[PDB]
Amino acid sequence: DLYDDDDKDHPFTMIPDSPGAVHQPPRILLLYGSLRERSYSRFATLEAERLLRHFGCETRVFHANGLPLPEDADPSHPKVQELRDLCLWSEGQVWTSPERHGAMTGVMKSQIDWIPLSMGAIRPTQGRTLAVMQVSGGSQSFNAVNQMRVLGRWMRMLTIPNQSSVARAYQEFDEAGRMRPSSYYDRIVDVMEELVKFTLATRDLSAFLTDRYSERKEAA
Amino acid sequence: MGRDLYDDDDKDHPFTMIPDLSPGAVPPRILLLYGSLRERSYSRFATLEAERLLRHFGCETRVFHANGLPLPEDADPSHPKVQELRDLCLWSEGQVWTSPERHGAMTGVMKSQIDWIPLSMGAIRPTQGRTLAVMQVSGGSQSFNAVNQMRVLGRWMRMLTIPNQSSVARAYQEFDEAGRMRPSSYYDRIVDVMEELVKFTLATRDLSAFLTDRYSERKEAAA
Amino acid sequence: RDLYDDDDKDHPFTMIPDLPGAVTHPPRILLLYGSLRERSYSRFATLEAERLLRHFGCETRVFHANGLPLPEDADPSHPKVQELRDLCLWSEGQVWTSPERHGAMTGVMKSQIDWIPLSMGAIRPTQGRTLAVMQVSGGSQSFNAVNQMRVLGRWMRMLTIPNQSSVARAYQEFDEAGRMRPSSYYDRIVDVMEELVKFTLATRDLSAFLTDRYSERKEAAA
Amino acid sequence: QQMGRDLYDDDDKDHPFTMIPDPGAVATHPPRILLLYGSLRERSYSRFATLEAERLLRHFGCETRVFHANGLPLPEDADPSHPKVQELRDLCLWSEGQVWTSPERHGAMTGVMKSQIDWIPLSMGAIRPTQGRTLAVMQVSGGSQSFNAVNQMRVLGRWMRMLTIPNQSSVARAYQEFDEAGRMRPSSYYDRIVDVMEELVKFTLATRDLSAFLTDRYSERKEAAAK
């Protein structure tokens, strides 16, 4: 008996409603997607980092140079452990991937593949916010960001609505790597703003948001 | 005077705002059972069970039925069904999309329903800011084609799609003749989903206007 | 002897595929669906594709979803539904042209395909037929619609040819009469229809042979 | 409105460069490369599915090669001279058809598979290593039978200008279907796998001879008209 809900375990049910505030937001940016020597995903990641630091975030950027393919080495590997620890530190993340062969990169997906959903006592991605972005040498398409939104859902991360797709990125960055004024840059600014907003509005409730009826019900 | 920033040349200094207020509220949850208007529709039954749970969590719920809805632009937007859906969508603070997997993808009914809702009705954005939970029923395996397409669609309706989702495999095995769902892990996941949706709706519905206050739009101060 | 490294196969139902009944104007049906708007750029692109297909030697039909009810909002008796089903059976190849509405295929397009059963008893109206996917958009050149329909082709067991068309800012590419101005977009449409006819000629004669699957023969349960 | 000397209802068609679509040829046993990529796990069910599919392809008359991604660096983490990269590229050229079998890790194809495909340029100067070659997509999963990986790979095939055959394989709870030696237990999943390899060989034989003709596009001929 559970108020016209036959299958519910009455003790494991809880109404959603809490206090708490923090001072800070850790945001890790995964420029992943290109280890290229001039990589526009890297330059876009760094512009996003500038914007996040202006918006009040503490930012770390992981470079996958020397990261082996998933399961090509033992997880003791330094790059793997760096990525896992940085994710642990993260409260939100930024995935910026070029559109290689009409999809997210092998680098991006390899980085996420090295991250366990549950690492012992820690769940490194669950509850953390996520903003997905993509650069492209051609048209403004969304193959990469679409795949990454779905992946975010499989990381039990809160993927923010807004996203940015930079078409023909080589035309938007100078030789130094800074991005020229454009609607693309403004969309990136909107995206980073929204990411910080959503991180502030949720980072305190992550433990409560991940308290699920299913998990409590297995209290048998 | 007043202008200019240190390392970021491209920003319009006045249009920049640090993200940081608002009070509480009462939460409207609109459920679109769309996907099958079949006379025994398992998507309909799952929608109704989700509504039971949502009302148990304290929600005011509306459920729209697409019976008689014409294809997008097959009738004037004056159409009663179209206006009902638009008004309910404005009423909503969060939503539930439950669609079967027809031909390995979301249905034309669901997609037609969303196609009838404009992103911008003049000054109003009917979906922006509202939360969203996507679920799917299937006669076969537990796949995610429909829910994946619907997560992306959520991204295009500027809605906050919650991470968790429900996919009912062999849905015909899970509902009795009355329409109630038998005990299974699927029901537990649906409860998880409605719980998370209500949590996120409460955690955002008061700040929705602030979250959609975007630097680009403020920069559009061209006058 | 009863096999050679493959324990699970029922040896009698196994067949090696070789060269197998060898052939005219290839039926290619175009589903302009995606817009019932009066001025629909998907419609104009569909008609340009039909012009090109007929120049390449095809017999073409174009179905309009005007008045088609939502799937199961009416009995399959509906004239539009049976018209579409019969046209689909007639087809040897198809063209699905959908605008990108809400970043995805339209409800019109998907509703049209939903009215088509994968198997209507013993006959499957989609199996074996070729497919070319194209998309028009009011904005950027994206691929959401063509990607979703490329997958749908696999779920309709249709052979979707590699090349596809994505028309960016279609309003800029069509005059008021509906003809498309010269562009890389039009040339790509021509490439797509050429490839579609090429692949249709290479498959229409083997369609029965290609759909003779080990699973089906193994069910020889007497 | 200067319009060349021929045309008819098609103002935009360059009358020169237009061609009517068609010849016979027998590499008689079709080269089919299988990329077990997706898992370098030591017991990888993707690998075992690849090997059973290879058995079936060889019985149906195909010459088969299987590439293992052990030691392949991430794309652009090393010079393309790297031995692993060059082996993969050469096998790709040798290929007339392919099989992509990837597990569904985190609800999508893996970084291993996509890194392998990212190492293959669409055009290395004048040659296209994937164009025209057939493609069969399959996936293994630790849970239910989903299609995220196979769908992403079906789209990738189009972007690799490959002809992806309709049928596909999705093996649910692969651990339940494989012995300790690596052979697959009898199941509907195995029947689908053979169906897929059958269709792949059928389409490879029906297209490998016309691929050059199939890849002759109005666009390329029209741009080959320079003055």
Numbering used by the authors:
A (entry chain D): 24 to 40, 45 to 51, 63 to 258
B (entry chain C): 21 to 40, 44 to 49, 63 to 259
C (entry chain A): 23 to 42, 47 to 49, 61 to 259
D (entry chain B): 19 to 40, 46 to 49, 60 to 260
What does the paper say about this structure?
Paracoccus denitrificans ArsH is encoded by two identical genes located in two distinct putative arsenic resistance (ars) operons. The X-ray structure of ArsH revealed a flavodoxin-like domain and motifs for the binding of flavin mononucleotide (FMN) and reduced nicotinamide adenine dinucleotide phosphate (NADPH). The protein catalyzed FMN reduction by NADPH via ternary complex mechanism. At a fixed saturating FMN concentration, it acted as an NADPH-dependent organoarsenic reductase displaying ping-pong kinetics.
P. denitrificans ArsH was produced in E. coli as an N-terminal 6xHis tag fusion, purified by affinity chromatography and crystallized by the sitting-drop vapor-diffusion technique. The asymmetric unit of the crystal structure of P. denitrificans ArsH contains four monomers, named A, B, C and D, tightly packed together into a tetramer. A dimer is the usual form of flavodoxins and a dimer of dimers is assumed to be a biological assembly of S. flexneri ArsH. The same holds for P. denitrificans ArsH. The pairs A, B and C, D thus can form structurally cohesive dimers and the dimer–dimer interaction is dictated by the combined A-C and B-D interfaces. Each individual monomer comprises a five-stranded parallel β-sheet surrounded by five α-helices and a short helical loop rich in hydrogen bonds. The structure of the monomer can be divided into two sections, the main body, where the β-sheet and its flaking α-helices are located and where the active site is predicted to be, and the C and N terminals that form a structure binding to the neighbor monomer. The sequence GSLRERSYS located in the β1-α1 loop and N-terminus of α1 (the underlined letters represent the residues conserved in ArsH proteins) matches the consensus site GSXRXXS for binding of the phosphate group of FMN. The β4-α4 loop protruding over the presumed FMN binding site carries residues that are highly conserved among the ArsH proteins and partly conform to the consensus sequence [VICL]-X-[IVC]-X-G-G-X2-[VIL]-[YFA]-X2-[AFMCLV]-[LMIVF] derived from the proteins known to specifically bind NADP+. ArsH appears to be less sensitive towards product inhibition possibly because its two cysteine residues are well separated in the amino acid sequence and located spatially far away from the flavin cofactor-binding region.
